């Protein structure tokens with residue numbers, strides 16, 4: 130459970146991300162694909178992208194980034210009361226896409242890295258700790274749902 134103070138640090142930096150959702154989306158996914166090339170294998174629609182240049186020029190990847198960050202933002206804004214939002218997300222990722230928890234750990238790393246690079250003034254040590262906590266909570270709850278749905282993760 131996060132304190133109100135920790136949620137405030139998370140939503141404060143998220144407000145900055147929302148000024149440019151598409152841009153943040155691209156940076157985060159490209160970071161993920163570059164650092165962990167294996168994750169690209171999960172997208173039959175992006176598995177053909179060979180360079181960062183092709184990734185940055187992909188309209189479909191940009192759209193995916195917006196879809197993902199909008200869903201994550203909705204969850205964070207619930208401040209822990211995200212049961213309803215997580216159910217459909219857990220079902221599609223465990224049953225259809227088959228995304229292991231390890232990959233959610235990788236994207237969490239990418240998110241923290243991008244926020245640190247683009248928002249140093251609003252992402253000091255305390256704020257990073259709060260964001261890490263919020264993302265760990267998200268991963269812990271999705272993991273619990275994965276189990277209930279029959280997917281090891």
Ligand code: HEM
Nearest residue numbers: 168171172174196197200201218221222226228232233236
């Ligand atoms: C911050 C965590 C993430 C959030 C909130 C998120 C959210 C979403 C949403 C809302 C969709 C569209 C609806 C759906 O199919 O459920 C989606 C699709 C998908 N996600 Fe996730 N996702 C996350 C992380 C990941 C990761 C780490 C991977 C893979 C390494 C992944 C792979 C996919 C795939 C393969 C699709 C379908 C893409 C397509 O065929 O159009 N997701 N995700």
